[PDB]
Design a protein around this ligand. Structure first.
Ligand SMILES: *[C@@H]1O[C@H](CO)[C@@H](O)[C@H](O)[C@H]1NC(C)=O
Ligand SMILES: *[C@@H]1O[C@H](CO)[C@@H](O)[C@H](O)[C@H]1NC(C)=O
Length: 298
């Protein structure tokens, strides 16, 4: 479904250029910032997909664009890419983020993009690294945002639960989540050697992180009746791909476990996270995943 902005010309200092930085003031008055990349094939009459990519704690929109490579037209030819900036270089959900409504920021950003661009409102996506992956999950866990965003790709996400380290049991801790629709697509990447946001979860900064299998299981549990899974060994079995599904919706929840990888956006080439490279590039996999899943009618 093409948005109201269809037919409108691009903002006049923006068509396939370097990303552009924009100040944007929310209804209630906080001035926020994002960088936006317009695909070189953008047409003002063609409903266009949109990807939000949320940076890690202490990082920036600009650094996240370099890391996540969603402005790379070889990997993402079709979608607008938006890199929002977190206040204090962090996002809602972090133990340090207080009374910052980043969900409202995201929702008002989306409303803006629908107004000014030809957005396909059935193909709006969210991805993020770490704090930004946690925030991606919060979007999926929000009754409203989960009905407006088609699919979600947290990378090494930090799914902080408000439970003390002493009481933290990472394989069973409740994960606070209220999706507004069934069949939410989730793609999660995580390194087994992550020391920052551990694969096995546990106490962190006064709060509690779930184990990543626990996270994955809790999402898949929602697919409910007909639930099945497969495992595949990839890259000579250094990577495991787990897919959950039901009545022929195979992989609606997918997890890549990357053996030996740290707290890193997966890339074959060096990136700002990881100087060595790993077995695979997450971003093409994420783009393909987004393409698999649209927001269903109603
Ligand atoms: C955004 O706002 C700040 C002041 O709040 C200003 O310093 C900055 O240059 C502005 N940037 C753009 C792209 O408008
Ligand atoms: C990169 O490779 C070196 C060995 O050359 C290793 O010591 C280091 O832990 C690696 N770093 C990461 C982030 O994987």
């Amino acid at each position: 479904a093409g948005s109201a902005g269809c037919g409108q010309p691009l903002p006049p200092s923006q068509p396939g250029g370097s990303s552009y930085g924009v100040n944007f003031t929310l209804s209630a008055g906080t001035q926020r910032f994002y960088r936006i990349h317009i695909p070189s094939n953008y047409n003002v009459n063609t409903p266009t997909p949109l990807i939000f990519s949320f940076h890690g704690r202490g990082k920036t929109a600009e650094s996240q664009e370099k890391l996540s490579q969603f402005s790379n037209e070889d990997w993402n030819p079709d979608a607008i890419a938006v890199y929002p900036q977190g206040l204090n270089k962090e996002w809602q959900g972090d133990p340090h983020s207080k009374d910052v409504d980043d969900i409202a920021f995201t929702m008002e950003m989306l409303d803006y993009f629908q107004e000014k661009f030809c957005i396909d409102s059935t193909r709006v996506y969210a991805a993020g690294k770490s704090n930004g992956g946690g925030f991606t999950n919060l979007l999926a866990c929000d009754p409203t945002a989960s009905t407006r965003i088609a699919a979600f790709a947290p990378v090494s996400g930090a799914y902080y639960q408000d439970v003390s380290e002493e009481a933290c049991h990472p394989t069973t801790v409740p994960i606070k989540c209220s999706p507004g629709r069934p069949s939410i697509p989730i793609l999660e990447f995580h390194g087994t050697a992550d020391k920052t946001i551990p694969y096995g979860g546990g106490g962190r900064r006064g709060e509690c992180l779930p184990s990543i299998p626990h996270f994955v299981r809790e999402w898949s549990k929602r697919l409910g009746y007909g639930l099945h899974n497969t495992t595949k060994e990839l890259y000579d079995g250094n990577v495991q791909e787990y897919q959950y599904g039901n009545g022929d919706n195979r992989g609606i929840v997918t997890h890549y476990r990357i053996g030996g990888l740290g707290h890193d956006w997966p890339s074959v080439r060096p990136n700002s996270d990881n100087p060595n490279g790993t077995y695979l590039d997450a971003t093409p996999i994420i783009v393909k995943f987004f393409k698999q899943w649209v927001l269903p009618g109603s």
